[PDB]
Amino acid sequence: VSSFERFEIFPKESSWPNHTTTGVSASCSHNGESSFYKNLLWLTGKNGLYPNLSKSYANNKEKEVLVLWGVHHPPNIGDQRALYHTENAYVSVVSSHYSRKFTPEIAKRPKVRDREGRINYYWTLLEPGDTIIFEANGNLIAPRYAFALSRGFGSGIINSNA
Amino acid sequence: KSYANNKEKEVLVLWGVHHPPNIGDQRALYHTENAYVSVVSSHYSRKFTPEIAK
Amino acid sequence: NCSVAGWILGNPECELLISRESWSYIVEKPNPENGTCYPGHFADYEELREQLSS
Amino acid sequence: EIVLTQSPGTLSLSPGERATLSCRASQSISGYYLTWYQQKPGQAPRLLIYGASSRATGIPDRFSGSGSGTDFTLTISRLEPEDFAVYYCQQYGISPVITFGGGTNVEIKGVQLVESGGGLVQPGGSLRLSCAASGFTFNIYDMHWVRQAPGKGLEWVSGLTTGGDTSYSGSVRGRFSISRENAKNSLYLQMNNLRAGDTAAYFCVRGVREVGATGGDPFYYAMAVWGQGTTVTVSS
Amino acid sequence: MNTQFTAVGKEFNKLERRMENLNKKVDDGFIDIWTYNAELLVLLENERTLDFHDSNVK
Ligand SMILES: *[C@@H]1O[C@H](CO)[C@@H](O[C@@H]2O[C@H](CO)[C@@H](O[C@@H]3O[C@H](CO)[C@@H](O)[C@H](O)[C@@H]3O)[C@H](O)[C@H]2NC(C)=O)[C@H](O)[C@H]1NC(C)=O
Ligand SMILES: *[C@@H]1O[C@H](CO)[C@@H](O[C@@H]2O[C@H](CO)[C@@H](O)[C@H](O)[C@H]2NC(C)=O)[C@H](O)[C@H]1NC(C)=O
Ligand SMILES: *[C@@H]1O[C@H](CO)[C@@H](O)[C@H](O)[C@H]1NC(C)=O
Ligand SMILES: *[C@@H]1O[C@H](CO)[C@@H](O)[C@H](O)[C@H]1NC(C)=O
């Protein structure tokens, strides 16, 4: 670290009116009470009303940025229809250097912390000046908060129980 | 289309994959919203199916 | 003579040799005769061989 | 959340008849937003229809609806004397506040929850209820406590998401207080400052799958399942 | 010596065994080299220390 901090790239309020945002899950819990990762958001349709999205951001802060999102893999289809109302998956997270799309399906898996479902997590740096775009037909984890930063040098990592 | 070496020297090859900023190009030129390309060799091979990305 | 593909996959001209449960080191030639009788790209040959270093 | 208007709150019709019922709100309200119930007096509610079209489990094919925006509608293809019942109109606010139509009597002319503690207290008084769970994961679902005066329109006393965002009505709030326990598989409702408006039969209600979990469990934005309820009364 | 502001360690998956066994071979390479050279230097410089003393007294 030379600088590292957390800010609110897209506030939960007012970034996503047209998708219901307040879904969480129960393995992700707090003192035996359900929850979800602070930095991030679910999105689903407004009472089964999924519109599809295109959003973006580019740096104004002039510091480097770190960004995170997710790609939804249900364990069953009735979720996929009920939330997002498309068997089609197509997402496009785009930048200048990096860009990638995602078109997954339902892939059943075994219980792991009582979860067959999966969301594969995906991430990138973003420098000053460069833009990110999201586009999607759903199946997403969206950034609420993102990590502003500078680089660092030479510091590192330990595993230790001392 | 294709090619294989007759020269008996090694070769270096280059191409590109089109990403319009707007669709009216894509229809006007190529007349398909579908993209599908397949550049193929023995060891290497890859396909490409992009979209309009503003 | 065999390539590793002819070894691992079960090329009948390559002796399978299930008896060979573990060994000291691997012996090949530089230019193994028996690659795949039905061709097809084989990815991560390097990584596999490293995994089968020992 | 918005005031509703059922149409009609009672009707009297003969066998071998349809029955058109229109529950409409102030504003236009998005369509997979309502769910439709019945109840026999003496029985708990049962689930029928959701999102103005689609149909629940363990069913004939006769109760079928339509409508969108401001005006939602459940129609009925055939009437029968086994249907002698009050039907309800229960909608999930975007303000997460369930709102209730006031019951619609059809007159025909010629796994589980368990509640705990219902009974009497004095007015202005203090008492608690509990519920307890059986054979599921009380972790997941968004829970609701509900009330019902006898042969009356319901009122939604409270609900809470498992993330902890409460929702009450502005009159009821403060005088009631909830608390949830998942490792214990049980629910609690301590209650104080109690007047005759609480003279009614209450229900513990298991609702909506939050986002994510293993199961062969779909969700709707309707209820999941009811409880058998219990009476509560103030008197002297 | 010049000791940098250093971070030694790394870690990998099992689809990176080349880099793993490499970086093992790398670092063990160096450790053995520094080990070897330094140990020789201790032996030699203590021997030369005795010879330094021996010369001075003589
Ligand atoms: C294992 O390796 C041996 C040695 O490389 C393979 O045998 C050789 O395969 C080549 C393939 O081109 C043969 O050449 C061909 O011969 C046929 C006639 O048989 C002809 O139609 C082709 O135009 C070409 O000339 C070569 O004769 C053959 N030599 C011997 C000694 O067998 C063998 O096929 C490999 N087997 C497997 C299972 O990989
Ligand atoms: C390895 O490859 C050589 C090719 O040089 C094979 O040699 C053949 O051997 C047979 C008898 O076994 C002869 O009839 C052929 O004339 C030989 N061919 C050549 C080109 O020399 C050898 O048999 C192979 N060995 C194995 C184990 O695969
Ligand atoms: C939601 O969609 C409506 C379409 O009429 C639009 O007016 C509104 O700005 C949209 N809001 C967002 C957050 O996309
Ligand atoms: C959503 O995707 C479908 C797929 O063809 C497209 O027709 C529609 O216009 C998209 N809607 C939005 C709001 O992007």
TrEMBL record, chain C:
Organism from which the protein derives: Influenza A virus (A/Solomon Islands/3/2006(H1N1))
Residues bearing glycans: 1, 34
Domain of life: Viruses
Recorded name of the encoding gene: HA
Disulfide bonds: 2-14
Parent-protein start and end of this portion: 71 to 124 of 565
Residue ranges crossing the lipid bilayer per the database entry: none
Protein name according to UniProt: Hemagglutinin HA1 chain
